[PDB]
């Protein structure tokens, strides 16, 4: 494919090996990762954005949480 | 050793389709090319297309598109060329040569068979 | 116009959940699971008397 | 592009004579040339298999290199069992194929 | 692998255009397109998250939209 | 062990946001950009007379 919509999560897994599991299993979070600490920029704003929408620290953790995960793994 | 046998060269009329075969033994046909360069008579020669046995597609020269098909085998270690038109203009004999997958060796026809010659005529 | 190259290993990549078989001739595909229920009815053990 | 190299003659006595290969930035010049005789009438041999790797070839007297758009080659102690005709093909990126030269009459007195 | 993180901001701007722009302006939204037309069962999820955690309308649609984003795109 | 192909497609994928820059001898950078100043005081005006 495009490489961008990875074939997993389908369910139809056996006890026998995937194709590439070792990788696979970190590749994106890395990818994330990398992101996170070549650019610090988008940090600063995505506490704000957490912050200033109405704030309960349940809701602040998940909305900081995913538009820090979701603005690197879908650019 | 390996060699291409290329059968034996035949003859035939404007309007009909010719094959030639061409059978290279002696080494894991899957993994290397060939290449079918055809060679006129007091001219320079100048390759057609690949055929990647295993899973290959043809690939031919961009005068030749349309011009020529290539299918082959796995079982019996054999690729097929035939002409679906002959016109006059096709009047020379016809190569095979193994070829690598290396990008430096998409050029390297390191061994090529006796030469199956074709003419046409009335 | 230019071909954009080749997809191989975007393909390689891309097949991170699937499973292995094998190609040689016919294809003997690994990796699934069958019920069976097993029938106990005919044996008998060597060397009971 | 396309690649078109010269006819020429040369003499039995040894003496270097350059097969001179011009190409274009997309099909030579960034790509391994490969160097071709045929004796004529039958099927032409590989002469290198490199850009100046020779398989088993006359050694120690056919050898040559590329430089930038230009690829060429040398022959020393030429004798009159080398008649032959002389060929460069490199492989073309671009346009996705392969690239044979015209032809070169190598005619050795 | 490589195919993955782009460096579509990377912000070295230019006034002609990049190697892909007309692919690469859309590839990402038709990947979650087409991960949400082979799969709706998330949108059920996404739904009933944002309505139990969302005390708020905008809350709620926030909540929504970033989850029904980073899920096929962490995919 | 396998090889898992070839990434020509995979970069050719990677550089979406990058320019273009034809290279024939050595290089020709185009889409470029740059800031000038024009000292215009010796500009005649070639049809006083
Ligand atoms: C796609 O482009 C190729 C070239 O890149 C076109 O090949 C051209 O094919 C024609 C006929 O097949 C060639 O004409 C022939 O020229 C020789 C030259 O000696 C002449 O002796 C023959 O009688 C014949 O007229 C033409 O030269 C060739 N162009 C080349 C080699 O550059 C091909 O037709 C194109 N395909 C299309 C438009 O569908």
């Known amino acids: 494919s495009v490489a961008l919509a990875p074939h997993v999560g389908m369910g139809l897994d056996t006890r026998t090996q995937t194709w590439m599991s070792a990788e696979g299993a970190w590749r994106q979070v890395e990818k994330v990762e990398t992101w996170a600490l070549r650019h610090p920029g988008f940090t600063i704003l995505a506490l704000f954005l957490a912050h200033y929408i109405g704030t309960s620290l349940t809701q602040k953790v998940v909305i900081f949480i995913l538009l820090m995960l979701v603005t690197p793994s879908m650019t | 050793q390996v060699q291409l046998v290329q059968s034996g060269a035949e003859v035939k009329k404007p309007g009909a389709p010719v094959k030639v075969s061409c059978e290279a033994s002696?080494?894991?046909?899957?993994?290397?090319?060939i290449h079918w360069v055809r060679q006129a008579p007091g001219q320079g020669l100048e390759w057609m297309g690949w055929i990647n046995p295993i899973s290959g597609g043809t690939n031919y020269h961009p005068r030749f598109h349309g011009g020529v098909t290539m299918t082959r085998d796995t079982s019996m270690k054999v690729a097929y060329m035939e002409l679906k038109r002959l016109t006059s203009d096709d009047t020379a004999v016809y190569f095979c040569?193994?070829?690598?997958?290396?990008?430096?060796?998409?050029?390297?026809?390191?061994?090529w068979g006796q030469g199956t010659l074709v003419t046409v005529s009335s | 116009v230019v071909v954009l190259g080749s997809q191989e290993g975007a393909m390689h990549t891309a097949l991170t959940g699937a499973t292995e078989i094998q190609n040689s001739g016919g294809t003997s595909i690994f990796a699934g699971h069958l019920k069976c229920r097993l029938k106990m009815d005919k044996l008998e053990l060597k060397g009971m008397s | 592009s396309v690649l078109t190299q010269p006819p020429s003659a040369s003499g039995t006595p040894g003496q270097r004579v350059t097969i001179s290969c011009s190409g274009g930035?997309?099909?030579?010049?960034?790509?391994?040339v490969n160097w071709y005789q045929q004796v004529p009438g039958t099927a032409p041999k590989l002469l290198m298999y490199?850009?100046?790797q020779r398989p088993s070839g006359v050694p120690d007297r056919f050898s040559g290199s590329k430089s930038g758009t230009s690829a060429s080659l040398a022959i020393s102690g030429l004798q009159s069992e080398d008649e032959a005709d002389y060929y460069c093909?490199?492989?073309?990126?671009?346009?996705?194929?392969?690239?044979f030269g015209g032809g070169t009459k190598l005619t050795v007195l | 692998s490589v195919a993955l993180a782009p460096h579509v901001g990377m912000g070295l701007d230019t006034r002609t255009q990049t190697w892909m722009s007309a692919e690469g302006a859309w590839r990402q939204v038709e990947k979650v397109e087409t991960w949400a037309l082979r799969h709706p069962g998330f949108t059920i999820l996404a739904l009933f998250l944002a309505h139990y955690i969302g005390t708020s309308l905008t809350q709620k649609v926030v909540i929504f939209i970033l989850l029904m984003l980073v899920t096929p795109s962490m995919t | 062990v396998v090889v898992l192909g070839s990434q020509e497609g995979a970069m050719h994928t990677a550089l979406t946001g990058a320019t273009e820059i034809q290279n024939s001898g050595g290089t020709s950078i185009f889409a470029g950009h740059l800031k000038c100043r024009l000292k215009m005081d010796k500009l005649e005006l070639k049809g006083m007379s």
């Open positions: 002696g080494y894991t046909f899957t993994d290397y090319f």
């Open positions: 930035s997309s099909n030579i010049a960034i790509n391994t």
């Open positions: 093909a490199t492989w073309d990126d671009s346009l996705k194929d392969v690239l």
């Open positions: 490199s850009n100046n």
């Open positions: 040569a193994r070829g690598r997958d290396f990008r430096g060796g998409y050029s390297q026809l390191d061994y």
